[PDB]
Structures are given as C-alpha cells and as structure tokens.
Amino acid sequence: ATAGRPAFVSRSVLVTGGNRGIGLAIARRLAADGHKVAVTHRGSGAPDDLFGVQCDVTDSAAVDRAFKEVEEHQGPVEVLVANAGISKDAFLMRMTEERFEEVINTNLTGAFRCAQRASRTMQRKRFGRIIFIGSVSGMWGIGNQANYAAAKAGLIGMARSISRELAKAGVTANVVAPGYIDLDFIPAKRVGTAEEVAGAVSFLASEDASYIAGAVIPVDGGMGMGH
Amino acid sequence: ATAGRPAFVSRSVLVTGGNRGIGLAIARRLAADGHKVAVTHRGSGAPDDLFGVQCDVTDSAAVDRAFKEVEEHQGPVEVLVANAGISKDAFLMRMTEERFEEVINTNLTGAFRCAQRASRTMQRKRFGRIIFIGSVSGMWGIGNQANYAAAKAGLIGMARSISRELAKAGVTANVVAPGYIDTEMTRALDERIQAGALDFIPAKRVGTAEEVAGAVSFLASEDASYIAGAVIPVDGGMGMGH
Amino acid sequence: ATAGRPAFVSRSVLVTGGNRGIGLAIARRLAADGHKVAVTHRGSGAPDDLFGVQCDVTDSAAVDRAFKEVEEHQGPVEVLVANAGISKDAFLMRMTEERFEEVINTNLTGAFRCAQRASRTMQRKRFGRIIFIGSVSGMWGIGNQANYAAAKAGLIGMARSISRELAKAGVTANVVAPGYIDTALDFIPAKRVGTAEEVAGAVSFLASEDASYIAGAVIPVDGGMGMGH
Amino acid sequence: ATAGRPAFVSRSVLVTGGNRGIGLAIARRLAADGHKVAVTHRGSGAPDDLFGVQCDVTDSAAVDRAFKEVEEHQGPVEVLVANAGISKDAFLMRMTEERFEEVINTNLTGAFRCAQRASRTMQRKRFGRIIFIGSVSGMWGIGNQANYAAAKAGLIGMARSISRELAKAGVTANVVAPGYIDTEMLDFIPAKRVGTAEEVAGAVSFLASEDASYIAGAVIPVDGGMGMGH
Numbered sequence A: 001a002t003a004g005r006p007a008f009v010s011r012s013v014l015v016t017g018g019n020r021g022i023g024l025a026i027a028r029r030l031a032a033d034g035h036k037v038a039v040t041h042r043g044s045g046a047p048d049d050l051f052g053v054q055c056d057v058t059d060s061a062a063v064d065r066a067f068k069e070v071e072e073h074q075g076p077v078e079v080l081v082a083n084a085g086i087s088k089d090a091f092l093m094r095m096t097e098e099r100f101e102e103v104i105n106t107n108l109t110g111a112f113r114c115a116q117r118a119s120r121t122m123q124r125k126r127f128g129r130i131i132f133i134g135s136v137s138g139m140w141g142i143g144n145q146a147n148y149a150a151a152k153a154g155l156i157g158m159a160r161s162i163s164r165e166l167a168k169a170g171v172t173a174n175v176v177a178p179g180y181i182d183l184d185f186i187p188a189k190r191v192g193t194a195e196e197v198a199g200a201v202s203f204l205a206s207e208d209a210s211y212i213a214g215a216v217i218p219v220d221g222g223m224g225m226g227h
Numbered sequence B: 001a002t003a004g005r006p007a008f009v010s011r012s013v014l015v016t017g018g019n020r021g022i023g024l025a026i027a028r029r030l031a032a033d034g035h036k037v038a039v040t041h042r043g044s045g046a047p048d049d050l051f052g053v054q055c056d057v058t059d060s061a062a063v064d065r066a067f068k069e070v071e072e073h074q075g076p077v078e079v080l081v082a083n084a085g086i087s088k089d090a091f092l093m094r095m096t097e098e099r100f101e102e103v104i105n106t107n108l109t110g111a112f113r114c115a116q117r118a119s120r121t122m123q124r125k126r127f128g129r130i131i132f133i134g135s136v137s138g139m140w141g142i143g144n145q146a147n148y149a150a151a152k153a154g155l156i157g158m159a160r161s162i163s164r165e166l167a168k169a170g171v172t173a174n175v176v177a178p179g180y181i182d183t184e185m186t187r188a189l190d191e192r193i194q195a196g197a198l199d200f201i202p203a204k205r206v207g208t209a210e211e212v213a214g215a216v217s218f219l220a221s222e223d224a225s226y227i228a229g230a231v232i233p234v235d236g237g238m239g240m241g242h
Numbered sequence C: 001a002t003a004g005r006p007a008f009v010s011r012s013v014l015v016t017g018g019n020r021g022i023g024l025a026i027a028r029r030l031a032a033d034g035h036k037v038a039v040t041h042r043g044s045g046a047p048d049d050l051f052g053v054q055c056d057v058t059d060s061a062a063v064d065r066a067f068k069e070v071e072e073h074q075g076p077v078e079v080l081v082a083n084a085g086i087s088k089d090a091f092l093m094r095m096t097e098e099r100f101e102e103v104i105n106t107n108l109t110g111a112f113r114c115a116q117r118a119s120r121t122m123q124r125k126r127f128g129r130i131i132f133i134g135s136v137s138g139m140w141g142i143g144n145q146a147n148y149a150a151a152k153a154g155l156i157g158m159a160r161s162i163s164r165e166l167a168k169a170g171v172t173a174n175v176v177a178p179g180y181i182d183t184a185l186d187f188i189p190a191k192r193v194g195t196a197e198e199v200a201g202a203v204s205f206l207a208s209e210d211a212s213y214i215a216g217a218v219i220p221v222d223g224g225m226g227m228g229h
Numbered sequence D: 001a002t003a004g005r006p007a008f009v010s011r012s013v014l015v016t017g018g019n020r021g022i023g024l025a026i027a028r029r030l031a032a033d034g035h036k037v038a039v040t041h042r043g044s045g046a047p048d049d050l051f052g053v054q055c056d057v058t059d060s061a062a063v064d065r066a067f068k069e070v071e072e073h074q075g076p077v078e079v080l081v082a083n084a085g086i087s088k089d090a091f092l093m094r095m096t097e098e099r100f101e102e103v104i105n106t107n108l109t110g111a112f113r114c115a116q117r118a119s120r121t122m123q124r125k126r127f128g129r130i131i132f133i134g135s136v137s138g139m140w141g142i143g144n145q146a147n148y149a150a151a152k153a154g155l156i157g158m159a160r161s162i163s164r165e166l167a168k169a170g171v172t173a174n175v176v177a178p179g180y181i182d183t184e185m186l187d188f189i190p191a192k193r194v195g196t197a198e199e200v201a202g203a204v205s206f207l208a209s210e211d212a213s214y215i216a217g218a219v220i221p222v223d224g225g226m227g228m229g230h
C-alpha cells in the first residue's frame, strides 16, 4: 500500500456555470490540480486558458452538443461539476409557478440533464465523478426558498439513486453543499470563500474519494447541522 | 393540562391523489378520524364515501378551482395531504428529459402548487398542516429513480423552507416517507423482485396503505403541533442511514 | 382492510423517570390511552394510581429487579419508554471526566440497561416497542453539551442497531427527540417552547398500533429547531 | 485569491489508535502530507517510522501525560485524530453491561478525553482540528452493535456540540465514518467492494488540510455508499 497521496490522474472535467463566481473558482482549482478543464458559458466565453463550450442547461440538445464538443477536445467527461444555478427567492404566498419552475429547471433538471449525458460514457469507461453543487438550504430550509431548497435537496436524492445504480461500475454521485459564500446561524461566525467550496470539489474529484458515494459534504461553517 | 389525547378538532382536509390506492386509504383514515375529507380525481369521479373535486396537480388553474370547490363544501383547507404522484423509473443512461420532467412536475411541482394555494388561508387563520407523501427513495436512493428520488427528496427541502417561514404562524410542513407498501403494482412484480426487496427491509415484510395512513393521521392530529420539517419514515427500517 | 384507527391493544408499559416532568406526562398519556402503565422512581413514588417500582438506571441489578416487579404486576414490558435523564453542561475545556461519564451513564448506558432487560421477553413474544427520549441536541449540537449531545446521539445509533437486529421479530426501537420543553426562541421556527403533553403525544403514537412499520426513526418534537443534516 | 491548493501548513498531529491498522494508515498518510505525526499505543510501541507515546484512552491521567509528551516532541497538538476503538459485538439479549460500557468507555468517552485535553491550546492558538473516526454503524445500525453503534453515533453529537461552541475560535470537530475496510476485516454496499485503509486516510488528510477550514460538524462517509439514508 502507498502511504501518501495517490498518484494524480488528469481527468476530463466539465464545470457547468464555470465562467464566473464559485464555478470559476472550482474550474481554476481543478485546472491547477492538473485536470483538463472545460466550462460552460452562455456567451461570455471561458476565462483564463480553459476550454469553453456554450450551453444552457435548460436545453437538452445544447447539453448533448456541449458534451460532444468537450469529448472531441479532451476526451469524455470523467468529472462533472454541476454548478450552474439560479436563485428566485420569495415567501411561499408570493412564489409563482414560473418562479418555482425556473429554479427547478435550471438547478435540478439542468443538473440531471448533465449527469444523464455524462453517464453515456462514464458507465462504459467504468469511471465517473458526478459532483452536484447543492446548498445548506436543501436540508436546513432557508425560509424564502421553497423552490431553491426543493431543487437543492432534490440533488441529494438524485445523487443517491445514481450512486446506488452505478457505484458498482465506478461511477459515483456526491453533493457539495455550501452555506453562505462570499452570521448568527453560522457557528464559524463568518462566510465562506469560493476557494473553500473549490477545495471540497477538488477532494471529491481526486484519487482520495473513490469510496465516497451519495454523500453531502457541507461547506457551511457548521450552519446546517441537524437532522 | 389534560393528561389524555387532546380534544379532537374536525379539520377541512384535502388529499390529492386521494381517489385510489394509498391516497384513498389516507383519506378514509382521516374521515374515520372525524375530519371533513375531500379528495382530488382526474375525471374518473369521487369515491362513493368521499367528496371529490376534479384536479390535475400539474395545472395551477385547476388547483385554484379545486381549493375553491373544497372551501365552498367544507371550509378552507386546514390539512393538505399531497399524495398525487407518478413513477417513470429507468436506468440513468436511458432516462429521457421527458421521463424526468414528468415525474418532477407531478410529484414535486404539483405538491408545491397545492401547498402554495393552501397557505393563503392557513397563514391568515394561524393554522395549517401541509403533509407531503415522500418516499424512502428520497434519502436512501432506490436505483433507477433519478427522477423519483429527486422529486421525493425535494419535498424535504420544500417542507423545511415552508416550516422555517410559517411555523411561527402555526403552519407546519412535514413529510411521510413510505418504503415498500403492498399494492396491486407490487403484487404484480415477479416473486424474485418482491423477495429481493425484502432483503433491504429490517422488518422483513412490506408495509400497508393503512400504516402510511396512520402516520398521516398522527401528523394531522392535535398531537403534532410542535413537529415541523420532519421526515416520518414508514418503511420497516429500510431507510436508516445518513 | 380496516379504514380507521387500528384495534387497540392494552400494552404493559414501563416509563423510566415517570414520576415528574416529561416522564409523568408520558405515563399519564399512555394510561389515558388504555395501557397498563408502570413508572420507575427513586423514592418519591408513582403518581395517580399508576404502578411504581424503585429503580436507579445506573444500577443494572436494580433495573433487573424493577422489570421483575412490573412483570409480576402487569405482565412483561411490551412498551419501554426510556425517559430517565440528566444534564450537566460545561464548556469543553471545563468539562471533567466525571461530568461527561455521569451524563453518559444515566442517559445512554441507563437506556441500554433498560432496553437490554426488556429484550428478554420482547423477542420471545415477537412484539416490543423500545422508545428512547433523545434531544434535538443529539444531531443539532447545543453548545456546552459534549456529554449530553453524545449521549442523546448515541441513542440513535443504539436504536438503529437494535432495530436492524430485531425488527424481523416485531421489536422496534425509535427515538423521540424533544427540543425546548416547558418544565432559545431565536433558534426555534415555531417561536415557542413545546409542552410535555406534546412529547407524550409522540410517544403515544410510537406505542400505538399505527407505528408497527416505524423502526430506527427520530421523531423531532422541537418546533423545527433541529432541521438540518 | 489563490487559484490552486492552498499552501501547505505542517501541523502537530496525534493519532490515537495510530499504531496499527487503519490508524497507522491515517498516521502514515498525514506524515507523508508533511505533518509532524505522533501516535498512541498501549505498550506494544509504535512502528519504527513514527514517534509513539504510550496512552490508554480510558485513563484521563494517561491522556494528559501523552499530550505533554507530544508537546515536548513536536509542539502542542493542532490536529487530533481519535481512532482508538474496540468492538465487542453481541445480540442485544446477550450483551452485558460490561461489554456495553467497555466499548463506550474506549470509543466515546476515550474520544472525549482526548478532545477535551486538546481543546485548551487549540482555543488559545485559534486553530484546531478534532477528527473523530466513527463508523457507518453509527447512523446505519449494523446489527449486534448496540454498544458500537451507540458510541460511534455519540461521536457525531459530540462533534456537533464542540463545533457549535468553538468553530468561532477556529476549532472544528468532524467525523469520518468508514464502512467495511480491508485492514479491519456486500449487497448493502453500492460500490460492491470493501474500502481500503488508505481511502479512509485520504478523507482524514482532507479534513486536516487547508481545504477544510469551513467544515464543522460534518460526517464524511467512506463506505462505498453503504450508509445512505436518514
């Protein structure tokens, strides 16, 4: 047995919503780790020296075409980070059907579209990491977020069903659940950074996370502790 | 303080998906409890013993009309049981966008449409019980259910967000999460499939629709006022974990 | 199939720490439900006309004697409510071994002693309800409660291992996890404390014929305080 | 903002139960990461590659003496990995008070004794990692383990209470929960294999690293999916 950090394997990575914000920090961290990193965008293009593909995750045909472009460039996606997401907060009595479904379609169905398309090759190659970006809200229930909490909790159920089916083929699905990212409900008494989220994603994309499936990694300063 | 079961209060109940199967058992239990029970149906009609309103939970306009019809008949809804649901199982690689979205739209968004419409009068009257029928799959992840597990876990997030907002106004949202429940569909699986499922159940038996209804009865009762955002698993221990 | 509440079965009940507080409300509720209710006490006696047995749950021999007295009076215990508990809070760097072990020994090991003794007959009769009284602190982690949170979370693990072994024989173990009960509001969505009778209502449900298919569950009675993961 | 892995900081590490098996893999991984690593043992000694201190975690005075010996060797403990543990399984009806209390005293109270002793200087320096090694059994309930599951779930409650109190001072407590691991030796495991001690060590490495500062009260399952549930 090797005592230290396992030898690095450069994986084909796709980060959806990887062109700015937390997604860009995730993409830059995975590239710095040594992975081949592609990001989706909706017109802004890709930053730094990352491979960009245009993709709206509400569009299944765009998702299919984006994955094909990534595969031609750098090989089939081995690590999917589904970071694309939106918030449309509202108290329950004021939340409209449109506002609920928009958040579901991007955050939950959009993550499904990417995971489903990624599985086409992951299962065949007997390796895959599907890493959903969830939220403390999924299990803690932020009060103006019936739609967002539903979508982000839904990622847990999806990750666990995917893992129960496919972990025997080397394909796992896990959730990183950030809290507030750049205080009374946060034990740490501070917000987190995008780089702290990216550090958990880096772990789940690494050779140190093969035996982790269906897990929620909370990056929230303890905010979401409970049951 | 009274020692025994609190005095019963007859609530206006609506059970979506209450016209057949497990939802019908839920509705019949709540009626036997003493509540005024209405059920939805999609055109096949109300059960002989229960007031029915035609309502497709994918149609926000139909949800609004149905709540108005219930209100006229028995007062505004105080206890909503969201049982309307469908399954479209598939291996992940085979699951189409349509199979995913149809399950989400009925099971998750349809439950939202009903909870949102119910909340109007619940907050104003400072009482409401929103009871989502989830599944062991939400937190345990039954294979071939990327859609169903996503929908049924989403009910937990929604229930907790609703509870954090509205519990102070006496409005709670909770989830009953059944495991394998004896139905016509389960008795039609091959015996190997039925036997294989028992291996994952510590109780080594399937549950009944009346056991699901017993948990719903509790959450609709005067014994559940201080329970909010909870998952009540009715699954013989199948879903134990984290 | 029966449409309404299942036919009632009058069970032999033992509530540990049943002479006051939450335990007394649990015992009185289960008696009103129609059960045959015994309580443990440490000298104060049982309330009402309930059957009392003297028992300190840190003493395995006393637990054995107490169950034998209940068995002789009303039949072997079918429903055990392990309510006896104590708290001894401290900041971590101030918490002593003594203060940690005292809380463990009563709240966790004491619950084990009662569950283990109850299992003598439950498995043979193919029925048992072991109901632990936990706390929101078990999974939420109230500060200054390294001992109490450890003990109350330990009840979850024990209930689940007991349930995985014995549910096939009709014996289940579950946890009722109260939040703040009148005998802080900033962390409670309901913006109120709970009552002992609300805890007892959850115990009544878990002792009833409506809860046979519930095993290893945590029923939170906390106004939403403990919501999380 | 730094794009890549944060600059490594060498921490003073103590791994209880680090002299053999899974704990030894944890200690060897943390040393390979660049940390200064000490392990406990109950008299058989540490392997020659690591500094060892004799310490029975059922003995509060021995825990105190062990921490002082580590302090004099490599500075006060900054990262505590509590791996010392035993199992004494039995059917519930057969399990004795002694068998229950022995597992609690080592696995739960012993972890407390070490976390309590570490806390003073961690709080003073405004940095601490307390990493309990739990088990899938804590939340999944392996049968015949009323004692082991109780102890390993108790670590979760303890980690959360410690985190709620001390996370604001830079001190966090988390749990790594292994499933079936090769060094300690299937339909319930989605991965359809046992894990390795080095896979557990990888999760501990993460929780000891500069990538885990904002994680407190978490359970990191290393179990092939075995424990998924609620």
Ligand SMILES: NC(=O)C1=CN([C@@H]2O[C@H](COP(=O)(O)OP(=O)(O)OC[C@H]3O[C@@H](n4cnc5c(N)ncnc54)[C@H](OP(=O)(O)O)[C@@H]3O)[C@@H](O)[C@H]2O)C=CC1
Pocket (backbone or CB within 6 Å): C016, C017, C018, C019, C020, C021, C022, C023, C040, C041, C042, C043, C044, C055, C056, C057, C058, C082, C083, C084, C085, C086, C106, C110, C133, C134, C135, C136, C177, C178, C179, C180, C181, C182, C183
């Ligand atoms: N807010 C709250 O009150 C909450 C309480 N709980 C739990 O509810 C349960 C009861 O709470 P509560 O009524 O408030 O506590 P109380 O102090 O009011 O009563 C505790 C009971 O336990 C008994 N007891 C304590 N130690 C022992 C022992 N070694 N052997 C036998 N009996 C013992 C006491 O008997 P005696 O009269 O002889 O002392 C008393 O009957 C406890 O488990 C507590 O942890 C959980 C969540 C919240």
